[PDB]
């Protein structure tokens, strides 16, 4: 007999943390990613700021602020859906870019 197996979210996750006037750090995430853990990495790479949140760009080109795990999940879900569209067309996949926010 045949059944559908799992469709993975996506193939490794890269979060590009863009740092003001300083460059970017590409964090390759090992496979749940928690909001807390993202803030912790931001605090390592941007150590002389305090970071309570970050932003990403949505499909409308708007900057969306993330302050919670539920918001993280909505960001990731959108990202994964974009990556899956591009994977199927052989388009270049770009990392998930975030912008630390005071």
């Amino acid at each position: 007999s045949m059944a559908l197996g799992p469709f993975p979210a996506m193939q490794v996750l890269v979060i590009r943390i863009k740092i003001p006037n300083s460059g970017a750090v590409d964090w390759t995430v090992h496979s749940q990613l928690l909001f807390r853990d993202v803030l912790d990495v931001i605090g390592q790479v941007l150590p002389e700021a305090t970071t309570t949140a970050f932003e990403y760009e949505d499909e409308d080109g708007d900057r969306i602020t993330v302050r919670s795990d539920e918001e993280m999940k909505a960001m990731l879900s959108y990202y994964y859906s974009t990556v899956m569209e591009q994977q199927v067309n052989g388009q270049l996949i770009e990392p998930l870019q975030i912008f630390p926010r005071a």
Binding site: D58, D60, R63, I64, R67, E71, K73, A74, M75, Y78
Partner: protein, 88 residues
């Protein structure tokens, strides 16, 4: 079958004082769900207004919201329900 029959969640994009937030809402979505999540998100009880491009309209009843979700579900060009939040 004894597993859940998930429908599509409603992706909502809230805006308040220049800050935007995206949250997914399980169906059926209720006005009070939107209000309570907007309170968690911005710290105050909000008035809720639907927005599409230049149009803004208050969402005051469950029926108003239902109309807005319908528009979103038939709109191949929109991927979120845009809700402008005003204090009160």
């Amino acid at each position: 079958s004894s597993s859940p029959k998930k429908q599509n969640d409603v992706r909502v994009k809230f805006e308040h004082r220049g800050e935007k937030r995206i949250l997914q809402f399980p169906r059926p979505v209720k006005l009070e769900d939107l209000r309570s999540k907007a309170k968690i998100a911005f710290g105050q009880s909000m008035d809720l207004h639907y927005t599409n491009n230049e149009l803004v309209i208050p969402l005051t009843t469950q029926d108003d919201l239902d109309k807005a979700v319908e528009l979103l579900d038939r709109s191949i060009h929109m991927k979120s329900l845009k809700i402008l939040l005003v204090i009160n």
